[PDB]
Point group: C2
Chain length 659, copies 2
């Protein structure tokens, strides 16, 4: 109905009162729906903003549950799901919106609440409700860049956008260029990874992944998704694999983990963001900051570093022991199948953790510690730095160090699992004899990258700015389109089903030696995974880069287990060319199959919002475990149903248009 | 003429282009005066903003000197006079405006430049030109709070002012309350001094003092004001005396100096300001930050901490030696008269310094070091913290530590001067027999303080905001009006002229005994200094608090000296004990013929050293105030009572 489209108007101009009129519509709000500030002059307002509006949306006055808890958080405050207190507030609001039976009462509850609660919080609470109600399905939620550009853009632009919108008439407005490589100069070698850390795309993917797989609320409210623990492990694990790749393409070494929390953090990061909702800026972190015990009475944080250390010590113990203990006292075994999934819920701390109290909230609490080094006891009345918000966490270099450490803990479990036997990863009959890649106007087995400007309308997000269009020009990494061509022989006499699994890693190390398996297995980034039907004899399989099941289209972002930006699919490489091993495996789909019916949807990649995850094999399956005896490098790890290919990744420092 | 009033329109809405129309007027700018962005759509603009304007100001197209250097500083960048490079840019722009023939070209040069150079820089360069130009005298420059509220107000208000101005019609707009005590909670005991550090008044006084008495290379005529070195010493010295007073009224100890620069700085400060011109916020400083060697290639700063330490070591040496050495190699003696004045120019590094190269730029460079602890090599592309701008420097607690240190160095010279002899501070014939104070509805010898909201129109400063009024409500310390009553006997047979010098200090120490002189002399804050004619026999002198020569009225500081509402320390609810002191000196000796306090435009009207009775050590035998006194002086126990209530302005 219309109602579905009318809720989307709530996302429009989050800080402009709801009675000011969104898009080509305006709400006809009751007077008991007006805020205390504006209620005493309600007559003057409804009339004043009624003009220039095509439609007028009525709103029925209903009960509305107690909104004390939702309103506890200040309006000009920041909102993060990592902070214990905010979790209880959001989970309560989510509960209200979720608990409105009708799509009409949801509209009424929303319209009332919207101008009383924290915009960032409202956006989250609504987003979660809409995505996981039955009546509001297939609903295309506006990009959070468009509603909250302050979390994605250098603060400098805002006073330019205000100038441009006030001075120049619509239609003649110049696109505002968004600064790139702006957080640090060349004295900081970390500044080279701007195109990854600070890319709009990857930050959106991270935010959205945490939307669809929360770790707190209600198991029926989306917490208990199939293998979300393993997902949490793998997704984040692939972030670092991809990061480590991009590091090698900028003459840097692999990211060093956060060994121990008492030693200083070498790499500081000033993010250059200004929250228009908090009206403040995000604090920076200085070089050689040290983690400090937190006492944030307001936020309900009373945590010592030793608490974190204690959780880690215990988790390590469990992993080595090979089992965990639940609240009840029973033992649950970290087996080949569900081990990783369990560990994930334990480490992140999802209410699915079999004993939160013992093994703690290790990952999340780490994010808070790292974000509050500048003001840990709240004496300076400062908010958390960028690592304290999922929306912005990936911008900071320390993210990759903390997430690197966490990964090592997971690894400690994976190296206990028994090696995949020759048998287990052979497909009797099937043989892959070669794989190549071809780009238009470029040699075989060669990928190209470059810079590319794209445009985004930030108009809906610019509160109290003269209406009209406000286009911003993002510069971001892009790759030339390509396609894989895979030669597979059947030699069986029957149609064989198979999973095509495509990963890509560096060929050599940082020192220039052909990489060993033990090393290289952890640097393989998934590139595609799709089902294929093979006829007897010979089969030529062709697959486009844009068909990738790891990726989501351009259109979705601007307009894994969840959608990685398409333009970030290929590592940057070097101008002189960066050598890389392309790997493909065809596994026996009959074993890997997960009997299930789905057409799929994602964040709103096929989707996988349907109960189960469509692959019985472990995530990162060929390379998640150690090598079997005798294996030493990729070229002797291979079975017949696998193939390797030398690829060369060439960057070109030029800015192509979008066409 | 009109021209004088037309320049004042440049101060209106600094970031709104000059062709958008200021007040009830608009400028008719040439097309070669437009900016490159807006030039190609000139046809659409001049017409679009021509409407709703009563007057239209024409502007003649002139040659215009090269504006390369002025334009070198980015538009979205911060501007500080402490940074070496900015000094050279501003001094060059000042030079351009200053060099324009008529006030028809001053207006033309200005109108062109305004939208090409950094607003903060423009404001400074213009302010300086107008204040010291030939045709432009007695011109009332708009308060810098009204043009740049971002340097004086929590950033939180800005999005409220934008909301209020867009939603609510004029006339029905609610005044925006400005948050007070907002930079730190009660876990930080320093937060108590918000009413002084963060008070609009005192921050304006500091900014303005540096306007009228620069040290900047600039030109020697502008910088060389009578005894500006001693002024620099005394004014800043009184800031800390007053600060130390306010500390005692908040159950704190005296401010500790910055002993040595290698040790951490305990007190951090996040100022909560957001520069709308830079579109960023000012960085904070964390607890236990350490000073670090600066390498800001862009700003032209290559200074090591050891450089600073070397300057200090040398300055100390000179002070103890008793003389300095000029560039030429000659020796100049730090005598009783001009010693302090010299030292001032040496320490701040004013171009008047007899040897900048040797004794350095000690005070100023310190401000930069302290403001860049968070990003000293520019690797993080961050700007300076609050201590890097005179406009905001007093907000940070470290200001008082750094300025406390500097004062100790001056003191090291003052303790070398010979004690004032009984003779030197006696007035033969004159005897002061008593001084008292009286407030309406309050016992004798009792001062009261409290909080008071006042209103300021920040409308001129709110760029790209719907036109109308935008009143902001400041909460600030205030004192009940009072008056001194002084009983003076002549016993001479002739009319005697005299200077009345009134200071106030704390009465007792940490242990609850009468403070000793050595201690107390440094805590005396000047309260008034005025000329009086005494008839033979007995004289009853009466002086109102609002007549103070240390102070200037409310009206000036909201539209220059020390804010009037800050004249009296806060005191305690239970009452704070204080010694009120008055001295009558022989005006004939003190006279400086001639046809106040810190800022006097003319030569300084007092031959005596600034601080006079207490600048030097005690003569032998003297031990406390009550035996320092001569007949022509008087002491009085005063009690300062605070009341935590908010009175209106009426
Ligand atoms: Cu995450
Ligand atoms: Cu994380
Ligand atoms: Cu100063
Ligand atoms: Cu200073």
């Amino acid at each position: 109905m219309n109602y579905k489209k009318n809720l989307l108007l709530l996302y429009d101009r989050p800080r402009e009162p709801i009675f000011m009129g969104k898009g080509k519509s305006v709400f006809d709000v009751p007077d008991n729906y007006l805020t205390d500030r504006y209620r005493p002059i309600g007559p003057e307002i409804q009339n004043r903003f009624g003009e220039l509006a095509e439609e007028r949306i009525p709103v029925r006055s209903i009960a509305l549950p107690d909104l004390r808890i939702p309103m506890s958080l200040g309006r000009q405050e920041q909102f993060s799901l990592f902070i214990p207190r905010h979790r209880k507030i959001a989970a309560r609001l989510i509960d209200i919106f979720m608990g409105m039976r009708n799509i009409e009462e949801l509209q009424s509850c929303a319209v009332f609440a919207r101008d009383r609660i924290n915009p960032y919080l409202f956006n989250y609470a609504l987003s979660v409700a809409l995505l996981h109600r039955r009546d509001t399905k297939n609903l295309d939620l506006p990009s959070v860049v468009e509603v909250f550009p302050d979390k994605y853009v250098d603060s400098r632009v805002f006073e330019q956008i205000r100038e441009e919108a006030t001075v120049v008439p619509e239609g003649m407005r110049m696109p505002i260029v968004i600064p790139k490589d702006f957080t640090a100069s060349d004295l900081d070698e970390e500044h080279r990874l701007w195109y990854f850390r600070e890319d709009i795309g990857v930050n959106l993917h991270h935010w959205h992944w945490h939307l669809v797989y929360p770790f707190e609320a209600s198991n029926r409210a989306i917490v208990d998704k199939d293998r979300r623990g393993e997902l949490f492990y793998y997704m984040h694990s692939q972030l670092i694999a991809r990061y480590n790749f991009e590091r090698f393409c900028n003459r840097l070494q692999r990211v060093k983990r956060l060994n121990n929390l008492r030693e200083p953090i070498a790499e500081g990061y000033f993010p250059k963001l200004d929250s228009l909702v908090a009206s403040r800026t995000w604090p920076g972190r200085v070089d050689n900051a040290v983690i400090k015990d937190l006492n944030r009475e307001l936020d309900q944080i009373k945590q010592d570093v030793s608490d974190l250390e204690r959780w880690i010590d215990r988790i390590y113990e469990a992993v080595h022991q090979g089992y965990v203990v639940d609240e009840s006292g029973n033992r649950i075994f970290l087996d080949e199948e569900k081990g990783i999934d369990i560990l994930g819920n334990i480490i992140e701390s999802s209410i699915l953790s079999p004993n939160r109290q013992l093994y703690g909230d290790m990952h999340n609490v780490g994010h808070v510690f790292l974000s509050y080094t500048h003001d840990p006891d709240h004496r300076h009345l400062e908010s958390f730095g960028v690592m304290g918000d999922v929306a912005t966490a990936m911008r900071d270099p320390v993210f990759y160090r903390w997430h690197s450490f966490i990964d090592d803990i997971f690894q400690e479990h994976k190296i206990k699992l028994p090696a995949y036997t020759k048998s287990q990863l052979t497909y009797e009959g099937i043989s892959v004899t070669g794989i190549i890649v071809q780009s238009e106007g470029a040699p075989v087995n060669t990928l190209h990258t470059y810079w590319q400007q794209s445009d985004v309308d930030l108009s809906r997000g610019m509160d109290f700015v003269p209406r009209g269009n406000v286009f911003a020009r993002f510069t971001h990494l892009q790759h030339a389109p390509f396609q894989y061509v895979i030669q597979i022989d059947n030699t069986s006499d029957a149609q064989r089903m198979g999973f095509v699994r495509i990963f890509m890693a560096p060929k050599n190390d940082e020192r220039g030696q052909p990489m060993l398996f033990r090393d290289q297995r952890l640097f393989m980034v998934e590139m595609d995974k799709f089902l294929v039907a093979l006829r007897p004899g010979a089969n030529r399989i062709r697959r486009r880069s844009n068909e990738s099941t790891v990726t989501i289209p351009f259109e979705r972002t601007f307009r894994c287990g969840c959608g990685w930006p398409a333009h970030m699919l290929v590592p940057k490489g070097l101008p002189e060319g960066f050598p890389a091993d392309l790997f493909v495996m065809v596994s026996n789909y009959e074993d890997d199959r997960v009997v299930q019916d789905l057409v799929g949807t994602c964040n709103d990649y096929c989707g996988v919002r349907d109960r189960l995850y469509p692959d019985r094999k472990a995530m990162g399956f060929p390379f998640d475990r150690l090598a079997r005896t005798g294996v030493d490098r990729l070229s002797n790890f291979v079975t017949p149903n696998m193939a390797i290919q030398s690829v060369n990744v060439i960057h070109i420092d030029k800015t192509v248009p979008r066409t």
